[PDB]
Amino acid sequence: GIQISGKGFMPISIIEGDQHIKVIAWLPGVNKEDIILNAVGDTLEIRAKRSPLMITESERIIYSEIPEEEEIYRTIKLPATVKEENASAKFENGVLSVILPKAESSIKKGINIE
Amino acid sequence: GIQISGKGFMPISIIEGDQHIKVIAWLPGVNKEDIILNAVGDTLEIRAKRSPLMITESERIIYSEIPEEEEIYRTIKLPATVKEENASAKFENGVLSVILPKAESSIKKGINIE
Amino acid sequence: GIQISGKGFMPISIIEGDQHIKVIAWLPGVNKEDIILNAVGDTLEIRAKRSPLMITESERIIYSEIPEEEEIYRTIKLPATVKEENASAKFENGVLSVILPKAESSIKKGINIE
Amino acid sequence: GIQISGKGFMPISIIEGDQHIKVIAWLPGVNKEDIILNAVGDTLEIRAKRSPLMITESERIIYSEIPEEEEIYRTIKLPATVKEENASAKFENGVLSVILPKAESSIKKGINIE
Amino acid sequence: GIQISGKGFMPISIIEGDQHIKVIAWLPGVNKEDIILNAVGDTLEIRAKRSPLMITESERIIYSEIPEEEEIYRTIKLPATVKEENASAKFENGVLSVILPKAESSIKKGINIE
Amino acid sequence: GIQISGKGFMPISIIEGDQHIKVIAWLPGVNKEDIILNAVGDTLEIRAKRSPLMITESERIIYSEIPEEEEIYRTIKLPATVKEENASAKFENGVLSVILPKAESSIKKGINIE
Amino acid sequence: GIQISGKGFMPISIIEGDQHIKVIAWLPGVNKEDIILNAVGDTLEIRAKRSPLMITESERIIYSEIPEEEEIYRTIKLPATVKEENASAKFENGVLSVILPKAESS
Amino acid sequence: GIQISGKGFMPISIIEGDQHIKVIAWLPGVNKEDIILNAVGDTLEIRAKRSPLMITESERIIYSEIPEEEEIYRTIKLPATVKEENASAKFENGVLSVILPKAESSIKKGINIE
Amino acid sequence: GIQISGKGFMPISIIEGDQHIKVIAWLPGVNKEDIILNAVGDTLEIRAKRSPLMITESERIIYSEIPEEEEIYRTIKLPATVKEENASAKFENGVLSVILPKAESSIKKGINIE
Amino acid sequence: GIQISGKGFMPISIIEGDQHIKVIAWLPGVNKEDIILNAVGDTLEIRAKRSPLMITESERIIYSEIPEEEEIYRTIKLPATVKEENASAKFENGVLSVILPKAESS
Amino acid sequence: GIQISGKGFMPISIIEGDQHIKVIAWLPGVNKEDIILNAVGDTLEIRAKRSPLMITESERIIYSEIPEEEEIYRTIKLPATVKEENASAKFENGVLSVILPKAESSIKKGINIE
Amino acid sequence: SGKGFMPISIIEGDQHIKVIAWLPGVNKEDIILNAVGDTLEIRAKRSPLMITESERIIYSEIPEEEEIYRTIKLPATVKEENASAKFENGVLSVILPKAESS
Amino acid sequence: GIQISGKGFMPISIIEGDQHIKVIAWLPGVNKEDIILNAVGDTLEIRAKRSPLMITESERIIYSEIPEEEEIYRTIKLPATVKEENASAKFENGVLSVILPKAESS
Amino acid sequence: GIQISGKGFMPISIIEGDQHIKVIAWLPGVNKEDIILNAVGDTLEIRAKRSPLMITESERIIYSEIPEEEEIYRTIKLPATVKEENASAKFENGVLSVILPKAESSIKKGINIE
Amino acid sequence: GIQISGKGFMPISIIEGDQHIKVIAWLPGVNKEDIILNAVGDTLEIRAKRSPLMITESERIIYSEIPEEEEIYRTIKLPATVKEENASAKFENGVLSVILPKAE
Amino acid sequence: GIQISGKGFMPISIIEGDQHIKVIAWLPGVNKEDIILNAVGDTLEIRAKRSPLMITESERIIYSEIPEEEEIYRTIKLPATVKEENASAKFENGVLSVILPKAE
Amino acid sequence: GIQISGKGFMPISIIEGDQHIKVIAWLPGVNKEDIILNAVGDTLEIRAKRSPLMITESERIIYSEIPEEEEIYRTIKLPATVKEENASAKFENGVLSVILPKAESSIKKGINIE
């Protein structure tokens, strides 16, 4: 079971590994400093901010599809415990990538048939 | 209660015994060596695949109701905890049968009064 | 074209060949000796029967997607005449395969191009 | 499969025997002389006609429901070839019964249970 | 004017004269003694039974349209009194005929035109 | 409401008489001999058949509106009994007038007002 | 049981007694002479009419709810035979009343 | 325009004159004591309090369509103004007549014609 | 046909024979002193006055489903004429049994042919 | 209100006094032998049956408002306790009358 | 818009003068006298009845579109009050003209701009 | 609690229970008051709407019926023998003494 | 018809006739001195206050269908113009009856 | 309350002051000389015309949106009487302004309080 | 809110504290010997039974809001894991007052 | 079923025998000292109260199903007029058992 | 009478003569080698796959309407029997022409007229 929520538009992808869990989050226009990272147990919290659609006074906006909200965040519920002390995060081109090593108790054991 | 999730076509029947939870599934055409079984606590994991139907270059398929995907997978939540070490499975005639001994019927009684 | 009719759940696939016609049928839960099978002319009838979902008095069914009926059958009208005397079939892992050698009239000849 | 064609009210019931075919038709108020019954190959012909109701000059109808058409026929295509020379029929109280021994070629061939 | 009701399928026509009243009924698949008739004054009830559409165990009704209920009857209202004790009836080929002499009191008298 | 029965174009009108009843009907083109007039109790019968619109062979009916049916009759149930022995009839210009003296028991009686 | 038929607007009410039958009817504006009453056996008949109104040349109708038809009648079947010779009728203020003694056999 | 309302049913008709004005309404079975002409006003006032339908203990109301309610009332909002001192009323045979001569203030004046 | 009507609660049962009519009626609380046996035509007239529920001055009725009205009657119309002179009555402790001779007629049947 | 229950057609009227309770029950067509009356505490039990609606093969039922059941009984509770040992009843005119004296505590 | 009312065919047009109001009414086929003209305040009334078309005994109206109703009248309100005491009207060739000088109060006052 | 058009209020006291009812247009004689145990019964009616003979009624929120009744039950037993009532300004008051409570 | 608006419990009935218009208003618990009445044109204004649900300190309200408002008024749209000078107000048994003579030419 | 009507495109705005009423109207392109304004009581009359779009002979209209009608007007009703003689109006830049000092038109209470 | 499972009637209320989790449950008619308590992990299991509701042949019941069931049980999920070794069974006046110390 | 009035939680069962009436009332958590029993005529009166679901300063409620009302009482009508001068009852394990002598 | 079946975009026209049946089919873009052509009895089998559209890395398909499905085939039921062993076919400019001589059993004979 997993649940995620937050404000604004933020494409996200999550991948599971036999020893870790990986997360990808699109954060265009956000610096690593503006990104706030908090992970513990089986949950993850991310908050971010960006400058608004500021323009020169003499200029005018004639077309806009980019969302203009500054503050954005996402809170994530993991399906199993992970070692936040051993997790790592990386930011690349308006995108954040995180690796979540699985907790020792969270790693299942193989079972045979007959 | 009981929950099921996964990929592909995999009918499943859940039967609860007084000493175990008996789970049945149909995997026609799957080789018995292609089946992978895993479980823990009160959750179950299933993996299986069947080789694709070979066809000669001159030959061609003219009608097919059978599903075409090779590998299928399911994850199930058991109604009660089971002992995986005592778990067993059987697969014959394209039908998978799984016996999951229940954790207890009237055990784990400790402290009692005072 | 081809017509199929009968009772019960029985996925079927048909494959065409220059010298024969190959057919695949799904019969999960049916014992290898429960399958009635023999072609005639350009048509075929198949009947099958599987054991019912027997449960011990200590066991009760809480959930079952799998159908319960035992006896099932399907009639088939082939698109070409075949030599049923030379027809062969095999049943493995709840799945039946059939080989139907064609007659001379159904052996298509090639044509030269310029 | 089977097909019926003709004009006039003529109830028909078709019953298939293992070695023959039995068909019943209603010809109420029809004299045996006004009945024509021919067949060949895999088809059956029914032509018959009933006299219209008579009335005396002093008399006059006051209410009627019976159909009045004098000429009626029905053509039925059998699902299998038959041996008309070996057929027979009976005609009781306006009800016609026939027996059509099946043609040897049309008789189903033996079937092997795997 | 007159009215009729009852169970079963039984089309009927009615004819009148200056001294008697006549009725016609269709009873396909009926026997001479399987009929009961009961009337008084200017009211009449037809009654009867027909055998069911029995078939042999080696025979199956691939097609039918004939109704099956055995007992069938009709209750009839007549426009004038008749001498039922003096009445008469016929039944051949599944068709039933009846003749009802008129009561003397109901005999209509002619009028001289000028 | 009184009852009207029969067929063929034959408009009617009826007049109540304190000591009789007067009936008017239209019989265009009907000879005085082809009229059958009977009655009893409280009902009247009119039977008559008009000759067809004869034409020589050379002629051809380029247009017509007159009804063509040759046999026509009407029957009416009067609202009171009549003494048919003292009925009288007249016929001029195709119009038929009939007078039916009322039965003595059928004669209405006036009531004094205070 | 009892039945009523006729044309026009003519409300009717009927009351039955052990030895007689009583009937009421509304006929506003109808002259006592216009009323015609007849009965026989176990049936009753009523016939009457109401004349339309006259006006000065100046008057032009602007509104009206009163029904227009003049001639009206009603016929009724009594629940039992009555002695019409012993019957009586009473009409007051556009309303009629009738007394219908029952026959001895009834 | 005009508007009328009140309980029960009470036919009324309004007709326009030039100098005088008259009104007629239906009031069947209404006692003269139910009518009062204290018409010091400029609109019509109507009521009726006829006696109810009384029966003897041995008498049963087998049929009744006349409304038995004792009280009804009516009054109309009228277009123009009329005098009251000259007002007069007359009731006959369940019908009421009223006279309401106009007032010079509301009497139309004929234009010099042509 | 038959019509049962009257005041008060009075169950009635009618049983018809070929030669007579048997009638059964419940008359609880009706005094036997009201024996007035007489009929006319094809109908029966009965009247009764069951005694009221007398109570002491200090007593009070707390619940009562028994009807309180004393006088009761019922008018029953038979489907056939019965000789009122031959009417008979019986008393069964609050139940009345009556036998009314009549005719049977209703003769038909006879030979089915000719 | 007091509690009532049972099966079959059996209208009952209940009357209460200062020192006794009087009960009236309809049992038309019931033989006194068929009546099984049992008073107890503050309630009365009535059990009864009659001859069922029966006809000869040559006779037919054409109209029957009377129900066809044979066995009928009723259970009737009372607002005050009554001494069943002193209970008595009378059955006349197809009606069962019962007298149930009270106790001094009610 | 202003109120228009009345019966009969009478096309009307209205012209508003600054000091008066002018009205035009079509009365084809009407004599000089049968026109009835009345007015009051700010409303106008017109009444007239035309002689119905005369036909000799030997003639017959084989085609017509002229309305036949004799009585025709109109009542029309005005947007202002007029001094009907000094109005004038004429009637030339079926068209009736009417002149209504406005009342002093009805005379609107002009407004100086700026 | 009754047919309708008869509002009632219940007020309880340590030694007595007070009830107030609105009966506008009701004569003092038409008021019928009864009490027993822990319940109160009130019934009343008003004078007819006297008017001129030939008038009509167009709109009336006043109830058309003559008799209006209300059934009330109280949380505590009261002595009906010592009950009293008042009727001023179209308001009906009643006093019903009771055993002392909280 | 007519429409009435305001606040508080005050059922109102209106009687219209060729002589005068009579208006009935329910004012339970109200004294005629508390009644304020004003009339103009074809509308009537009624304003008044009643005696509240007076209770002693030891008395507590447990069930009150009556509304607790003390101030009540209603505005009535009369069917026709009336003369305020000729109107008379009558108050009996908590009910305000007012006679409203109609205008000369209305 | 307020009412407005007329013909032609003519935007208008209405403003009520304590001692006057202010109303605005759009008259694009109209000359001051082509403006007509009259009022009385609590109503206003607006009449004016605009020169239609002239065009030199060489030119030709290719796309137009302005309303074509020249003669236009509006009739307006105010909610209170005004002193037209004291009114003032001003037209600028295709817009007309109006000031209407109110008449007495003042009230406090319907009648004395009590 | 925690989840509970079992059969019978047994209202339960759970109170959490800084150092322990306090559980309040109702077991009317149950003797202290009939109360079976099991604490493990983050769940508390209770099984209980009261005296038989026996009645003589003449004796009968006219009305009752209490079910005839004699034995009941429940499994209660706790807000957080509780040290089973420190779990204490308490029961006063028909109310189970079990205290379950928290695992920090 | 039958009309019974009161406040709070207090299920009551009525069992009637030959010469006695047995009434069982659930009183879980009710103070054994505050229970008041009174009988008169053909009716019974039960009055008591239970302590509230109070918590310590280091405790907090996050899930509850047991009712928290303090004052509770019920009024019951007996099927027969018991000897009001010989009423008796017993209270154990949060349940009140009442034995009332009765005639036959 | 003619059955066309298969998949892909391949417009076809069928030309018949007395001796031979000629069939035309469009195969734009296909190569002479990727065509599978076979026939027997009265059925014609055409199959081929066209190479998918090629592009260069720097290039982009800014627009397209050419169907891209790689493989296509058709199966036609001729209205006559054909001696395939003497067949012949051509392929020029993407269009396919096939010549099929008719079997002896299909060459129609002439019926002389009078």
PDB file of N, CA and C in Angstrom, chain A residues 108-114, chain B residues 32 35 37-39 89-90:
ATOM      1  N   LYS A 108      12.212  -9.407   2.125  1.00  0.00           N
ATOM      2  CA  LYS A 108      11.605 -10.723   2.233  1.00  0.00           C
ATOM      3  C   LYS A 108      12.617 -11.813   1.883  1.00  0.00           C
ATOM      4  N   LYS A 109      12.242 -13.054   2.189  1.00  0.00           N
ATOM      5  CA  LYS A 109      13.083 -14.220   1.960  1.00  0.00           C
ATOM      6  C   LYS A 109      12.428 -15.135   0.936  1.00  0.00           C
ATOM      7  N   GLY A 110      13.246 -15.699   0.050  1.00  0.00           N
ATOM      8  CA  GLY A 110      12.720 -16.583  -0.971  1.00  0.00           C
ATOM      9  C   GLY A 110      12.127 -17.847  -0.379  1.00  0.00           C
ATOM     10  N   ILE A 111      11.126 -18.384  -1.073  1.00  0.00           N
ATOM     11  CA  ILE A 111      10.418 -19.585  -0.645  1.00  0.00           C
ATOM     12  C   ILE A 111      10.314 -20.535  -1.830  1.00  0.00           C
ATOM     13  N   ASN A 112      10.563 -21.818  -1.575  1.00  0.00           N
ATOM     14  CA  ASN A 112      10.581 -22.829  -2.618  1.00  0.00           C
ATOM     15  C   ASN A 112       9.192 -23.440  -2.801  1.00  0.00           C
ATOM     16  N   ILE A 113       9.072 -24.310  -3.802  1.00  0.00           N
ATOM     17  CA  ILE A 113       7.829 -25.004  -4.122  1.00  0.00           C
ATOM     18  C   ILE A 113       8.093 -26.499  -4.031  1.00  0.00           C
ATOM     19  N   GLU A 114       7.296 -27.192  -3.223  1.00  0.00           N
ATOM     20  CA  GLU A 114       7.433 -28.635  -3.066  1.00  0.00           C
ATOM     21  C   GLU A 114       8.849 -29.004  -2.636  1.00  0.00           C
TER      22      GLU A 114
ATOM     23  N   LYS B  32       5.753 -26.333 -14.962  1.00  0.00           N
ATOM     24  CA  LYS B  32       5.841 -26.301 -13.509  1.00  0.00           C
ATOM     25  C   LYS B  32       7.123 -25.637 -13.028  1.00  0.00           C
ATOM     26  N   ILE B  35       7.084 -21.474 -12.388  1.00  0.00           N
ATOM     27  CA  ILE B  35       6.282 -20.926 -11.302  1.00  0.00           C
ATOM     28  C   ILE B  35       7.205 -20.511 -10.165  1.00  0.00           C
ATOM     29  N   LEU B  37       6.956 -18.881  -6.172  1.00  0.00           N
ATOM     30  CA  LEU B  37       6.041 -18.697  -5.054  1.00  0.00           C
ATOM     31  C   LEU B  37       6.775 -18.018  -3.908  1.00  0.00           C
ATOM     32  N   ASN B  38       6.171 -16.962  -3.365  1.00  0.00           N
ATOM     33  CA  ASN B  38       6.726 -16.269  -2.215  1.00  0.00           C
ATOM     34  C   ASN B  38       5.588 -15.698  -1.384  1.00  0.00           C
ATOM     35  N   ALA B  39       5.813 -15.625  -0.075  1.00  0.00           N
ATOM     36  CA  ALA B  39       4.812 -15.113   0.849  1.00  0.00           C
ATOM     37  C   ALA B  39       5.497 -14.766   2.162  1.00  0.00           C
ATOM     38  N   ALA B  89       2.816 -26.253  -2.126  1.00  0.00           N
ATOM     39  CA  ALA B  89       2.087 -25.955  -3.348  1.00  0.00           C
ATOM     40  C   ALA B  89       2.119 -27.164  -4.272  1.00  0.00           C
ATOM     41  N   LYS B  90       1.127 -27.225  -5.158  1.00  0.00           N
ATOM     42  CA  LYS B  90       1.019 -28.277  -6.156  1.00  0.00           C
ATOM     43  C   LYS B  90       0.540 -27.664  -7.461  1.00  0.00           C
TER      44      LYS B  90
END
